[PDB]
Design a protein around this ligand. Structure first.
Ligand SMILES: O=C(N[C@@H]1CO[C@H](CO)C1)[C@H](OCc1ccccc1)[C@H](O)[C@@H](O)[C@@H](OCc1ccccc1)C(=O)N[C@H]1c2ccccc2C[C@H]1O
Lengths: 99, 99
């Protein structure tokens, strides 16, 4: 599909059998979701945004469906303001910017 | 053109007769640039992202050239770690997300 940017590019994602809303963010290097429970062990990571840094939990090889497209990659979990789908997963679904 | 997301989507912009490097960011509502001088009056504003909020100066009706395309819109100036071209200007050049 083709998504315009007059409004936030929010889409529905499926993870852990649950539906959630997330933002397609080309400005994010990684994918970060709001506090939730995921399987396996996690590794520590610090990510810096416009207002500073925050600590997040890194989970690898996580299955996530974005607009029907299945992806399997790294997902970070932490005190993010909104769910963010970053470049690591946008590339998996073949997302590009056009103009 | 079509931009892939394997790497950060950085482009050259021209503002105030100056050439700068900026990130095409669909996750950003507005455009925000690091400290610089712009003509006209401004208004104080607080914007929040990952990490928290930062205080910026809001300028309106600012002209910017992105990849040869002229665009007019609001530009925020403040302690941002990287120059960001947000949705308010991406829409003006006809930028869309596709997959
Ligand atoms: O801060 C953001 N948007 C707000 C909304 O409008 C303000 C600008 O007018 C900025 C974006 O984050 C999503 C969001 C939406 C709505 C409310 C709150 C937050 C913005 O695109 C950031 O995601 C992005 O801002 C652009 C940027 C890029 C590089 C360095 C610093 C900042 C950023 O914080 N990227 C970091 C990130 C995020 C998740 C995982 C890994 C990493 C490493 C870095 O890429």
């Amino acid at each position: 599909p083709q998504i315009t940017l007059w409004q936030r590019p929010l889409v529905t994602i499926k993870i852990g059998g649950q539906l959630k809303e997330a933002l397609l963010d080309t400005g994010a290097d990684d994918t970060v979701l709001e506090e939730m429970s995921l399987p396996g062990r996690w590794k520590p990571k610090m990510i810096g945004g416009i207002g500073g840094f925050i600590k997040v939990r890194q989970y690898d090889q996580i299955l996530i469906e974005i607009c029907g497209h299945k992806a399997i990659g790294t997902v970070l979990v932490g005190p993010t303001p909104v769910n963010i789908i970053g470049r690591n997963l946008l590339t998996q679904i073949g997302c590009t910017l056009n103009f």
